[PDB]
Symmetry: none
Amino acid sequence: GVVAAAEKTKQTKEGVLYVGSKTKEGVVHGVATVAEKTKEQVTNVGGAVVTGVTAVAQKTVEGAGSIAAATGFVK
Amino acid sequence: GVVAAAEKTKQTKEGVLYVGSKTKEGVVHGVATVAEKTKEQVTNVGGAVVTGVTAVAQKTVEGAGSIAAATGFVK
Amino acid sequence: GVVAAAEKTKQTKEGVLYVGSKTKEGVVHGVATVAEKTKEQVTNVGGAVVTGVTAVAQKTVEGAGSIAAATGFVK
Amino acid sequence: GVVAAAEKTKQTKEGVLYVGSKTKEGVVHGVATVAEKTKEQVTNVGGAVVTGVTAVAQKTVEGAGSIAAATGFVK
Amino acid sequence: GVVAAAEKTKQTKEGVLYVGSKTKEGVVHGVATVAEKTKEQVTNVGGAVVTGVTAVAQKTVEGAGSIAAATGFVK
Amino acid sequence: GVVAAAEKTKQTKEGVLYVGSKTKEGVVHGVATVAEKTKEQVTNVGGAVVTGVTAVAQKTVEGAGSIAAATGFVK
Amino acid sequence: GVVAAAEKTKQTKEGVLYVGSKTKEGVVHGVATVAEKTKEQVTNVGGAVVTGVTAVAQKTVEGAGSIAAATGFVK
Amino acid sequence: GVVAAAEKTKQTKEGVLYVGSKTKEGVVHGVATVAEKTKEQVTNVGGAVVTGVTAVAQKTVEGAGSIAAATGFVK
Amino acid sequence: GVVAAAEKTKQTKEGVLYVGSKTKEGVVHGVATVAEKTKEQVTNVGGAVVTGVTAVAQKTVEGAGSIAAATGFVK
Amino acid sequence: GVVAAAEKTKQTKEGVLYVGSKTKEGVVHGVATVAEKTKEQVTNVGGAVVTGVTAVAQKTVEGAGSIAAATGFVK
């Protein structure tokens, strides 16, 4: 029973963004899952993932955001 | 029973962002899961992940945000 | 029963951000889970993770934010 | 019964941030979980994690924020 | 019964931040959990974790913030 | 018989130099002799060697300059 | 017979130099001789070696300059 | 017979120098001789070696300058 | 027969120098001879070696300067 | 026969120097000879060695300067 329910019932500068970036070398890998000689691996990533030399996450969840995750195994 | 419920019922400068970044070398890896010769690994990541040389997370959860996570196994 | 419920019922400079960053070398790894020759590993990360040479987390949870996590195993 | 409930029912400079950072070398690792030859490891991280050479966490939880975590195993 | 409930029912310079940082070398590790040859480890981290060469945590919990954590095992 | 003989017998702006250089990154190696797994190497450098991002060699040999070089081997 | 003989027999702006340099990063190695796993190496450097981000060699040899060099081996 | 003989027999702005240097980072190695696992190395450096981010060599040899060098071996 | 003979027989602004240097970080190594696991190394350095972030060598050899060098071995 | 003979027989601004240096960090090593696990090393340095963040060598050899060097071994 992995249920994620989100409801949004709705009846000057807002959220204005300025970014200036100057990079010479950049290595960004984000979400990564590496397995070497591994017998068993389970990985789950949910939600907002902002990454990089200049990472800005503004006003990410204004309304309703549900992240339900059942990660794992059964023997 | 992994349930995540979010409800948002709704009946000058706000949230204004300024970022200036100057980088020469940058290595950003974000969310990573590395397993080497590992027999068993379970990993869960939920929510907002902001990463990098200049990471800014402004006004992340304005409304309703639910992160329900059942991470693990059963033998 | 891993339940996360968030409800937000709603009937000059606010939240204004200024960031200036200057970096020469930067290594940012964020959320990481490393296992080497490990027989068993369970890892859970939830919520807001802001990381990096200049990490700013402003006004993260304005409304309702629920993080419910049941991490572990059963034998 | 790992329940996290958050409710927010709502019927000059506020929250204004200024950051100036100057770094030459920076190594930031954030949330990390390392296991080497480990037979069993369970790790849980919840909430807001702000990290880095210049880490600022302003007005993190304005409303309702619940972090419920049941971390561990059963034999 | 690990329950965390937070309720916020609501019917000049406030919260204004200024940070100036100048670093040459910086190593920040944040939340870390290291296990080497360990048979059993359980770790839980909850709440707000601000770390780094210049760490500022201003007005962290304005409203309601609940951190309920049951960490441990049963044999 | 490696003989170098130089004789100088002597019985408004002259030689005036102006240099303005502006560099951001510069790698200058000059005279270099690299041998890797080499069984035999003979190297000779003679005279004036001017090198670099802004290299100026003005009025190098006003008088007598002799460079005699016998480079090599005998088996 | 490696003989170097120099004789100088002697019976408004002259030689005036102006240098303005502005560098951010500079790596200068000059005269270098590198041998790795090398069985035999012979290196000779003679004369004037001017090197670097802003290298100026003005009026180097006004009089008599002799560079005699016998570089090498005999088996 | 490695003989170096120099004789100087002698019976407004002259040689005036102006240098202005501004560097942030500088690595200067000059005359270097590196041997790694090398069985045999012979190196000779003679004369004037001017090196660095701002290297100026003005009026180096006004009179008599002799550099005689016999570099090498015999088996 | 390694003979170096120098004879000087002698019967407005001259040689005036101005240097202005501004450095933040500087690594200068000058004359260096490094041997690692090397069985045999012979190194000779003679003359004038000027090195560094701002290296100026003005009017180095006004009179007689002899550099005689016999570098090497015999088996 | 390593003979160095120097003879000087002698029967407005001259040689005036101005240096202004401003350094934050400086590592100067000058003349160095490093041997690691080396079976045999012979090193000779002769003459004038000027080194450092601001190195100035003005009017080095006005008269007679002889540098005779026989560097090496015999088996």
